[PDB]
Structure formats: C-alpha cells, structure tokens
Amino acid sequence: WAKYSLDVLLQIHRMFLLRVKLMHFVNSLHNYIMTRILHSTGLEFQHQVEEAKDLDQLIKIHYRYLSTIHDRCLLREKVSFVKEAIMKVLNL
C-alpha cells in the first residue's frame, strides 16, 4: 500500500526529490522483508521438510519455521519500538 501510494504519482520538479527520499526507503525495506527472511528461511525450510519421514517432526519443523520468521519480521514483542515507526511512516 505504501509502495503503490508512492508509485502512482505522475512545486516544480522539487516534489520528485521528496519522492526519491521516501520511495527508496520503502523499496529497500520491501527487498529486505521478502528476500532475507521470507525466501531465505523458506529455501532452507523446504530442504528440511522433504527429508521428514515422520508425522511428529513435520509439525515441529513447521512451527520452528513460522516462529523464526515471526521473530525476524518481528511481531512477538517490542511492537512499541519497532512497529510504531513503520506505522508512522505509513502516515508519511
């Protein structure tokens, strides 16, 4: 939502520097969130589940896949020092 709001727009040329000043920040953050967590940790996780021959360990590797992506993209605690910053740059 923040990326598309910053990428829909067609002063003088000065508005456009303000475009770069924010659009770069959200774009780099987007690249981080996908690649370094949700695809790196996903790529190791697949190679782990394709060698599970047990009912029991299959739940466990999955919970230990979500709970580390849920840590890396943090939502577990300290949402008053990380989450609020992302929320206010959404209002930006």
Binding site: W1, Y4, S5, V8, M34, L38, G42, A52, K53, D54, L55, L58
Partner: protein, 48 residues
C-alpha cells in the same frame, strides 16, 4: 510409506505452494484495484 502416500495424494506441498502465494504480482493487482470499504465487495473483486 505413510509420508510417501501423503505426497502422492493429499499433497501437503500443494497447499504449501498455494499458501505463500496467497500473500505476495497477482495479489498486487487485486489490492491496487481497491486503492481506487465493504466485506461483500471484496468477495466479488477477489473471485474476479
């Protein structure tokens, strides 16, 4: 044997592939149309 016949019928990998595709190209287009609300409106846009 049980894990083999769980990946030849009732494939967990299939539901896994669908899962992480129902967030993150296609779901971009769906939400950008909503940029320009209501809970029954979303059903009919989603099914489109």
């Amino acid at each position: 044997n049980l894990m083999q016949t769980l990946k030849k019928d009732y494939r967990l990998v299939e539901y896994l592939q669908a899962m992480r595709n129902f967030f993150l190209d296609t779901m971009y287009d769906f939400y950008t149309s909503i940029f320009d609300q209501n809970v029954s409106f979303l059903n009919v846009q989603l099914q489109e």
